[PDB]
Design an enzyme around this catalytic site. Structure first.
Site, PDB file in Angstrom:
ATOM      1  N   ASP A   1       0.746  -1.181   0.028  1.00 36.56           N
ATOM      2  CA  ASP A   1       0.031  -0.084  -0.372  1.00 36.56           C
ATOM      3  C   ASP A   1       0.826   1.140   0.153  1.00 36.56           C
ATOM      4  O   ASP A   1       0.949   2.015   0.314  1.00 36.56           O
ATOM      5  CB  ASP A   1      -0.447   0.077   0.771  1.00 36.56           C
ATOM      6  CG  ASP A   1      -2.508   0.864   1.015  1.00 36.56           C
ATOM      7  OD1 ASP A   1      -2.113   1.213   0.130  1.00 36.56           O
ATOM      8  OD2 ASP A   1      -3.164   1.110   1.750  1.00 36.56           O
TER       9      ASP A   1
ATOM     10  N   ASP B   1       1.764   1.573   7.836  1.00 40.95           N
ATOM     11  CA  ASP B   1       0.614   0.760   7.803  1.00 40.95           C
ATOM     12  C   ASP B   1       1.446  -0.626   6.760  1.00 40.95           C
ATOM     13  O   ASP B   1       0.901  -0.470   5.276  1.00 40.95           O
ATOM     14  CB  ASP B   1       0.100   1.660   7.009  1.00 40.95           C
ATOM     15  CG  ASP B   1      -1.513   1.081   6.564  1.00 40.95           C
ATOM     16  OD1 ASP B   1      -1.707  -0.197   6.803  1.00 40.95           O
ATOM     17  OD2 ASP B   1      -2.066   1.872   5.947  1.00 40.95           O
TER      18      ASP B   1
HETATM   19  N1  LIG Z   1       3.258  10.703  12.317  1.00 38.77           N
HETATM   20  C1  LIG Z   1       2.676   9.750  12.076  1.00 38.77           C
HETATM   21  N2  LIG Z   1       1.714   9.703  11.926  1.00 38.77           N
HETATM   22  C2  LIG Z   1       1.017   7.576  12.119  1.00 38.77           C
HETATM   23  C3  LIG Z   1       2.046   6.896  12.568  1.00 38.77           C
HETATM   24  N3  LIG Z   1       1.525   5.577  12.503  1.00 38.77           N
HETATM   25  C4  LIG Z   1       0.157   6.557  11.576  1.00 38.77           C
HETATM   26  N4  LIG Z   1      -0.244   7.548  11.384  1.00 38.77           N
HETATM   27  C5  LIG Z   1      -0.991   8.496  10.818  1.00 38.77           C
HETATM   28  O1  LIG Z   1      -2.737   7.383  11.393  1.00 38.77           O
HETATM   29  C6  LIG Z   1      -3.069   7.060  10.066  1.00 38.77           C
HETATM   30  C7  LIG Z   1      -3.464   5.590  10.121  1.00 38.77           C
HETATM   31  O2  LIG Z   1      -2.029   4.934   9.926  1.00 38.77           O
HETATM   32  P1  LIG Z   1      -2.195   4.294   9.092  1.00 38.77           P
HETATM   33  O3  LIG Z   1      -1.028   2.912   9.589  1.00 38.77           O
HETATM   34  O4  LIG Z   1      -2.519   4.275   7.571  1.00 38.77           O
HETATM   35  O5  LIG Z   1      -3.558   3.373   9.538  1.00 38.77           O
HETATM   36  P2  LIG Z   1      -5.179   2.487   8.526  1.00 38.77           P
HETATM   37  O6  LIG Z   1      -5.373   3.243   6.895  1.00 38.77           O
HETATM   38  O7  LIG Z   1      -6.219   3.586   9.029  1.00 38.77           O
HETATM   39  N5  LIG Z   1      -6.282   1.200   8.711  1.00 38.77           N
HETATM   40  P3  LIG Z   1      -5.584  -0.268   8.466  1.00 38.77           P
HETATM   41  O8  LIG Z   1      -3.373   0.588   8.191  1.00 38.77           O
HETATM   42  O9  LIG Z   1      -6.203  -1.645   9.065  1.00 38.77           O
HETATM   43  O10 LIG Z   1      -6.116  -0.005   7.168  1.00 38.77           O
HETATM   44  C8  LIG Z   1      -1.871   6.864   9.296  1.00 38.77           C
HETATM   45  O11 LIG Z   1      -2.605   8.480   8.339  1.00 38.77           O
HETATM   46  C9  LIG Z   1      -1.203   8.812  10.175  1.00 38.77           C
HETATM   47  O12 LIG Z   1      -1.990  10.177   9.384  1.00 38.77           O
HETATM   48  C10 LIG Z   1       3.566   6.978  12.626  1.00 38.77           C
HETATM   49  O13 LIG Z   1       3.783   5.917  13.035  1.00 38.77           O
HETATM   50  N6  LIG Z   1       3.791   8.257  12.373  1.00 38.77           N
HETATM   51 MG   LIG Z   2      -3.726  -0.049   6.369  1.00 41.15          MG
HETATM   52 MG   LIG Z   3      -2.942   3.845   5.842  1.00 37.40          MG
END
Ligand SMILES: Nc1nc2c(ncn2[C@@H]2O[C@H](COP(=O)(O)OP(=O)(O)NP(=O)(O)O)[C@@H](O)[C@H]2O)c(=O)[nH]1
Ligand SMILES: [Mg+2]
Ligand SMILES: [Mg+2]
Ligand SMILES: [Cl-]
Length: 298
Positions: free
Chosen positions: A193, A212
């Site tokens: 992704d 992610d």
């Molecule tokens: N700065 C920062 N932001 C983060 C981090 N982890 C998550 N985020 C923030 O949180 C959001 C959600 O994280 P993500 O792993 O992308 O989850 P997902 O896309 O919603 N859900 P899934 O991965 O279950 O489909 C990211 O888009 C980002 O804005 C990190 O380690 N650092």
């Molecule tokens: Mg995700």
């Molecule tokens: Mg994500």
């Protein structure tokens, strides 16, 4: 906003015995997951019951495999807290600090800065794709076979009620799927992704983190170029992906583009299938509408 946070605060403190939540805010939302920033320091990703079971189990296995085997300065999540059950899963890790890459930011960068960012990306993908993935071999993903299964589900459910135009879009995609060779190349561990909203920059605009890996698996090498090659408002652009592919090397660029173009064509179907599986009529509708938008373009 206030209420979600309270429930999640409770659950975090309940499942992680000595963890004290002094602050908590929603930092992001998928369609069936939510991410929270806690104590200004920890990211907690959470999920209730979903069609895709074992999602956070695999994601956790991948972080662990990568933290053990990657040699890189680029940071990725390192899981400190996890709770995994059918009805509820939670992953917690320290927030990676930085600024998410966007088209706007990219356009302010000098040519040299852009080059170094491209090199950083190529290098990271080269190292990940080069890993011996024996120890994560359970995390295989066959996109072609997945599509065939989803097509069968369509046939078993709503296909007969679709319009001719909708059916033709689907059949024309299936015919292309059957003729293509882009699934027959190198398989490796991919982020899967790999879009710019998952890429973090440090204060010199160099790549400092990637987040992610929730869809990661052993899959076609081409997968990790799909967004880098995308021409849209959210991504940087096709030239960006092309240059990265040249730096990465030893990969057929034209097939990478074919792979991206096929995945993009599938999108409205993928949307419909999500609606069917999750009993969300709104997705079924949106996908069908999108088929008309694409059919009438040009
Ligand atoms: N700065 C920062 N932001 C983060 C981090 N982890 C998550 N985020 C923030 O949180 C959001 C959600 O994280 P993500 O792993 O992308 O989850 P997902 O896309 O919603 N859900 P899934 O991965 O279950 O489909 C990211 O888009 C980002 O804005 C990190 O380690 N650092
Ligand atoms: Mg995700
Ligand atoms: Mg994500
Ligand atoms: Cl509908």
């Amino acid at each position: 906003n206030a209420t979600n946070v309270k429930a999640m605060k409770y659950l975090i403190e309940h499942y992680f015995d000595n963890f004290k939540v002094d602050s908590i805010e929603i930092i992001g939302s998928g369609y069936d997951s939510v991410a929270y920033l806690v104590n200004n320091e920890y990211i907690f990703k959470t999920k209730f019951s979903t069609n895709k079971k074992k999602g956070f189990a695999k994601e956790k296995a991948i972080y662990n495999f990568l933290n053990t085997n990657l040699e890189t300065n680029v940071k990725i999540p390192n899981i400190e807290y996890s709770y995994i059950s059918d009805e509820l899963s939670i992953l917690g890790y320290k927030e990676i600090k930085g600024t998410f890459l966007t088209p706007e930011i990219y356009s302010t960068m000098s040519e040299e800065e852009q080059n170094l960012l491209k090199r950083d990306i190529a290098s990271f993908l080269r190292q990940m794709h080069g890993l011996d993935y024996t120890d994560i071999s359970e995390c295989t993903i066959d996109n072609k076979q997945n599509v065939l299964e989803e097509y069968i589900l369509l046939r078993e459910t709503i296909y007969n009620d679709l319009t001719d135009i909708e059916k033709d879009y689907i059949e024309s995609f299936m015919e292309r799927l059957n003729a293509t060779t882009v699934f027959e190349g190198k398989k490796c561990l991919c982020h899967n992704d790999f879009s710019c909203n998952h890429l973090l920059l440090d204060g010199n605009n160099r790549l400092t983190g990637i987040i992610d890996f929730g869809d990661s698996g052993i899959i076609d090498e081409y997968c990790d170029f799909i967004y880098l090659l995308e021409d849209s408002e959210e991504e940087i652009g096709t030239n960006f992906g092309e240059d990265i592919l040249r730096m990465y090397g030893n990969i057929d660029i034209e097939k990478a583009k074919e792979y991206q173009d096929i995945v993009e064509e599938y999108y409205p179907i993928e949307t419909i299938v999500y609606g069917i599986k999750n009993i969300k009529q709104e997705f079924i509708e949106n996908g069908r509408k999108e088929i008309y938008k694409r059919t009438y373009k040009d």
